[PDB]
Amino acid sequence: VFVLSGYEYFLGFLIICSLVPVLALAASALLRPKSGRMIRLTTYESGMEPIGGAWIQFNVRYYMFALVFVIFDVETVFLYPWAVAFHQLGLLAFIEALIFIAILVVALVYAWRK
Amino acid sequence: ATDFRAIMKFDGADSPAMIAISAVLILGFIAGLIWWALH
Amino acid sequence: GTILPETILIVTLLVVLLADLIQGRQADRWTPYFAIVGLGGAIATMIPLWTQPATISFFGSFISDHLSLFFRGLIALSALGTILMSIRYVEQTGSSLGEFMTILLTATVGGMFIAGAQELVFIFVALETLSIASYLLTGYTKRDSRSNEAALKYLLIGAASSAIFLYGSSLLYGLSGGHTQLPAIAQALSSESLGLVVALVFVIAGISFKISAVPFHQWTPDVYEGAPTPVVAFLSVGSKAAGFALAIRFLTLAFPSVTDQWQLIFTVLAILSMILGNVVALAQTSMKRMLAYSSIGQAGFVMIGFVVGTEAGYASMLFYLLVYLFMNLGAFTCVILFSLRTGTDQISEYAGLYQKDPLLTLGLSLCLLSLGGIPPLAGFFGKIYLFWAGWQAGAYGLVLLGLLTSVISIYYYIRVVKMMVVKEPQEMSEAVRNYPELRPLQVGLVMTVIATSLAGILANPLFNLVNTAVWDVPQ
Amino acid sequence: EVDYNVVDGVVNLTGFVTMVTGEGLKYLQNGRAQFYALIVLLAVLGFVIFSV
Amino acid sequence: MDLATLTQTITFFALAAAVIIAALGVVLLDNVVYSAFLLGGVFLSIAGLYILMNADFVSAAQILIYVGAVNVLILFAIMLVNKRETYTPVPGRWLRQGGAAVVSLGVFALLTKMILQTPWQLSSVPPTPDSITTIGQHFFSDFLLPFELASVLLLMALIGAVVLARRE
Amino acid sequence: MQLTYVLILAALLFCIGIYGLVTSRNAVRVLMSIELLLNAVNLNLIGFANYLDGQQIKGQVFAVFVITVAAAEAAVGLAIILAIYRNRDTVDMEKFNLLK
16 A cells, blocks of 8 residues: 555655766766875875874854754644644634744743843 | 679680570470470 | 643643743842742642542543542642752752753643643653653753763663653554554453553553662662752652552553553562662662662552552552652751751761751651651551551552561661761761751741641541542542 | 570571671662663563563 | 565665664664764665655654754764774673673564564555645644643753753 | 564664663763664554554654654753763763762
């Protein structure tokens, strides 16, 4: 049983699109110089050589945004069928969903004030 | 024990062996009498 | 439809938002008050819908019979006491207050939902609200390594146990066709089977993590040491009450009231819990660790409470749990009030306190003694009513064993009184030499100690309560 | 001496036994989440073996 | 005995092999970055398995949340805590594994013994395609409390993580 | 394509997740296994929904709530792990043994 009708192109196209990179890239090794491996493998630090140690001094400046993104991105999945069923539902489900959205906005304001 | 130091100065009474063969007699005495009593 | 059973919950929910908004605008407000006000208003809203109307269901996803009223009011009182404790305890540490009470009220709303639920999805979501809030509050003071370690370990363990519960719930949806309800689930499958037993056991694993039963206990000791203390005070009482309400309302009603092997499993867990907590707390030096293993043993007493379902074992659980609320909150108020002033340390530093602060001594002594089953005191009546019920049905080994483990637990409950009373001024510790000698805490301690010292003889008014509550569960 | 040793020691031994039991059972609690991961789900699955 | 049911079968077994291999890669590989990317692969393969089972919304949501957001969060948190993975072995490093293995294996067999013993109710009716309007109806007819309450769940989780990872 | 092997595949993910849950050395590598367990349960639910209860899908909604809560809980877990990395400066989970 398969009622989705609209697939059997997704599969083959996932195949052909997973096959364009591997094939345009395999049509490069057949015609290209080989490796040149001594000093062309070094790492680009603007002409000079890297200093050493090579750490990053990690920060939450990019973690916290992923955190709040996970929150507000889980949230949207609760809204697509709401919008799509808003024809059938009508009232008392808009009143009941603006609660969801208002508590979301409270979370947004919390993250905003910090 | 070491607290019982008076005219009660019997030496061979605190050893574990003598305590054992004293408790044997006392327990066997009460046991012979409880068997005598039931029957 | 029928939001009237829901009012209490959403009422508390309202103030959650409020206690963030005033905390987002002012950053220093009087939020400790009127949270008490809304919790009192909730417990007041419980009376009009206690017995005046009949039991009703929201949509079938939520039922509000007297049992749910009991557990909801209980968890609300636990949150109230924990707030009254934690106001000037969390302020002593360099941390906020608004997010704290927000999370505490959120856990409270979750546990007040889960006591009246009969549907799988909603059970899981409420359980996860309470669990995640606990995961946070365990690590809210991240300046210490042990707090964060406990929060990590508690989070990971609880996530795994919840996933097991969730697998079992998936199976129970699977079996009997669709049915995500609970009265309809134990309605289309009504016979012993392998998969039903697997689902049973996984749900037992999910619940025992909440009610601290052994071998599902290893989180309680480490977490109760590491975590903030008033967090633990809410955690034990509220998480247990939610767990036991879940146990009844799942195993009895939604799950099955046929495959009654779970009684045997709870006998095993209660036996092990009594034998473990009361024995291993006897070898400790910290209070919070001792209280953890105590809580395990008290859970074992409760578990023999409701393993004998005859309309009195369940009632005995309910009463003893109401009573353990007061008792344990009083003990935690006393250890808070000691750890604030100068001490901030373990059992051996309580010595010689009867000269400095006699009020705290009265409080903690009465609470600890009630936990061990001492006469006139409420815990004694709770334990003897447990024994009455569990003996009436025919469990003979459990009664003797629980009695014996209470006789064992009195030892480590009396060590603290040996310290606080017997130890003379020639044996004070360094902490008590320089002891000096807040308001909401004192009034809470009084309101708690008078209860645990008077709510044992004044018992008929709240045995009628519980026996009115427990007409509803099948048996 | 039979009273102070053969009678008293036998019952004080009860306290000794239920003390050393507590001293030696806490090692079950070892401070390892993986040991709980073992004796949580292997703590059960014995409860299924004598069930069905 | 058909071409349309054959593609479903071949795709299903391919996706299942990918899932198993990538999960074993998550769990066995010493390096953890490879494990994170293979975890993303597991998520994609499971989202492709759901489509065979007439669930498209939840499939797109798994591709949108887990691999999209959570996996990125893990790929941040992992370089937050990389220090050349200098771990010295313990003597019982094998022992624990063995225990886990047999325990885990038993569970599988036990679960398998259920899955092949119980008479499932196959319910021969064609499923419904509109698996998104129906979920909208269920969020406001049956499962409304979880909607309204997961709201405050997400609020509380934000409030928690924001004040547990904050640098101070 | 049958319900039986779907259930078996989910149980195999469950087994593997337990193996990674007990075998783990790191602390971020445990949430990965937990997420695998949650995926397995979702898979069981979707199978039940397709075969057993189709005309009103009811397990798909429950899987939506599952992926929701799992995302939130993973968020909170990584937040805790970021904090323990501040103090102990590692994630070797066998160094978090504060009991003997």
